[PDB]
Amino acid sequence: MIQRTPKIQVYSRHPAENGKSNFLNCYVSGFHPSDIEVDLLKNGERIEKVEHSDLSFSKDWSFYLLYYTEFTPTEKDEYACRVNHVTLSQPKIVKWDRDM
Amino acid sequence: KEVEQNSGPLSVPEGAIASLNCTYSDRGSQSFFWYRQYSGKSPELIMSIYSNGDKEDGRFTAQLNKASQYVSLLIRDSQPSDSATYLCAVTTDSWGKLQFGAGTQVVVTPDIQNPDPAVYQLRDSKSSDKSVCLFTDFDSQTNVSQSKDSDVYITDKTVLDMRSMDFKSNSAVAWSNKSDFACANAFNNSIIPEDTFFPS
Amino acid sequence: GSHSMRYFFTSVSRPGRGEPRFIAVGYVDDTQFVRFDSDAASQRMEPRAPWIEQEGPEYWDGETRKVKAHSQTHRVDLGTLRGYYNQSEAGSHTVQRMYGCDVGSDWRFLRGYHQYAYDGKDYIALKEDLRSWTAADMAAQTTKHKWEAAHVAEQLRAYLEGTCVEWLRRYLENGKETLQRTDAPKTHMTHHAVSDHEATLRCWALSFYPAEITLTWQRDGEDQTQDTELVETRPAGDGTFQKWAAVVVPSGQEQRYTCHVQHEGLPKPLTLRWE
Amino acid sequence: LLFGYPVYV
Amino acid sequence: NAGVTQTPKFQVLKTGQSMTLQCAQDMNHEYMSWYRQDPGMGLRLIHYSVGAGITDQGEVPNGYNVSRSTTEDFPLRLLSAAPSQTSVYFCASRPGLMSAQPEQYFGPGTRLTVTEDLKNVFPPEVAVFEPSEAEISHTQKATLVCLATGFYPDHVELSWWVNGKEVHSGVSTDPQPLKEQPALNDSRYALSSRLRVSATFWQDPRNHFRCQVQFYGLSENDEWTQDRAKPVTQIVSAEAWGRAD
What we know:
The PDB classes it as immune system. The complex is a heteropentamer. Chain B is mainly beta. Chain B has 2 domains: 1-110, Immunoglobulins (Immunoglobulin-like, Sandwich); 111-200, Immunoglobulins (Immunoglobulin-like). In chain B, 0% of the residues lie in helices and 42% in strands. Chain B contains no helices and 16 strands. In chain B, strands 2, 4, 5, 9, 10 and 11 form a 6-stranded mixed sheet that branches. In chain B, strand 4 (31-37) and strand 5 (44-49) form a beta hairpin. Chain E folds into 2 domains: 1-116, Immunoglobulin-like (Sandwich), CATH 2.60.40.10; 117-242, Sandwich (Immunoglobulin-like). In chain E, strands 2, 4, 5, 6, 9, 10 and 11 form a 7-stranded mixed sheet that branches. In chain E, strands 12, 13, 16, 17 and 18 form a 5-stranded antiparallel sheet that branches. The termini of chain E are far apart. The relative contact order of chain E is 0.16. The chains are: A mainly beta, B mainly beta, C alpha+beta, D little secondary structure, E mainly beta. The interface between B and E is large, with 56 and 58 residues.
């Protein structure tokens, strides 16, 4: 019975220009088992309108999932991705960094 | 009408090649079958083919061409015991319904090295009151037709098998009940050759 | 050059919460074209690429049936393997299956595969020759004897060498614009001095298809990988891909560091330098 | 196109 | 056919009678189907089952009935027999998910004849005809023909028996029984068969030839208040003898 901690990357589809339309991605990958809780956050509040990809795996059988929402970056609004899994002892908040 | 088959009947002599055509319409078909069915019994499986190209098994050879959607069956060195109707069958998966064609009837006619056609009258010693005309030992080209009046019942061309020499022969039987008739009048509609024996 | 068509299947059991979750996904190279999820609305194989929508009602009926058959073997497989390893009824377990085929630049058959996992590790896999099986353990050996008697290998070999490559080719010409595109990376480099003594150079590669890319660091020709962070290649979400790679550089020496980019949309490979 | 003959483990 | 078996071989029913055709299978298959086969329609699917417990309808399910409590048996009930159910019926078997072998195998078939009224059932009249006054003195061979006549339905099995033992060794039986008056659906049938041997085996008077016809009709169970003898499942036979000329 294998368990693998997810790798979380929070990022944008296009380079973030302030006040322009874009997509905010949270790609979780390299995890096992598939039971994962993933939420996108704007200023701490949960974003309802989040799409996600269909569940697939890599050559090592580990799962990957893209979760994504339509957004418009400003200077003050803070974005984060919230990930829960069995490997994590408490849930993981990963803040969006725009030059990452 | 998903599986289109050769109409029929197909007639080949013994030792020849009978080729059978089959055309299917579901592009995603994956497994392909030929079934042999003798008259009065169950369809019996003889050839399965799973991928593009030729597969050989004894006297049977089956091709598959998925690009033009085509199954074939070739019968090399044809026995008279290949006289059956042959079903083309096609499926997509484990759970898919099998798609059958109508079937093509194949008739294998035997070799007669030299025939002499002959019509014979038979009786016995019973209380049954009818004459039987046996038309036998004849050419494999010769047909049998059975629509004259509502009295004379004529059968079909059947092939007997003597395992003493090789002496196979064609035969046909015609009769009637409560009416007098000769044996040179029941096959009067059928075209018989110039050297047929009539009771001396 | 080479292309591939792979199908991915995941089945996870739900102890005391009914039937298993089943998800099936199909790819041609790095583009998803079909999906089934046991938890979705439609209960059918659904399209995921524009060029596959032109398949008619018989295709979807057929793929719905077959994907449900898969799902059914998996439903039983979870109960079978639970028995096989004497595991309790109280836990959730996972089955993974992946099969598919590779073709060359000539589009003719190159390679075929079918592997199977249980709880995230190997269980059974079809060998290179498409005739034999590798069993991962004493349990898996039972599955292997059963699959010899079931003639699985034979039917997989007919599929992988025939139907898998016949359909890949159909897909590859139906999605000419999509699948035979090759997207060059957009490249730039950033500088972020985190302290007064050291600096971090970050090479970027953005907007590329297919996902196979290679990003290497170097100091004056020789391949530096000691002070090096490289993220997993990630999807942008528009069909293209992204990847960055970094170095922790003793600052003032940024000129004698080069970043090397390999991708099949690039004619010659790219060197990058900061000044 | 999917494989047509999946078998139980 | 070592796998797929079906009971019965032959059946006559009248309009509205119930019967069940047993089908069994040996090879641990999940996918079983019922087919009917008819001259203009080919093979048509009645009902089918892809696992134990479960069943579903084909293209012609009307008036038929089906269950699958076990993986071995797939019985087809007919509840009220109708004259349009007159057909050959085939049980068929396919592995489904327990094996990757694609092939579907068939049972040997049940010939079913549904008539308007039970008075139409008739046993055959069998007569053997002795070889010709010319044939022995022309071809050095002797053809015994047999007539089986005036039977309904076409549910027969012909065999020739010389000296007590069954021969197949020189026989052409007709493939199908032909109609006597081809205008009726109550119409009865005739079937012919030929046995050929040499001159030095027909002329031997120790030799006893017999054309044997097995008829499949009523059972000793059906109601019968008729003038005629009751046309049960029976064998009618006729004989000819070795004769020197």
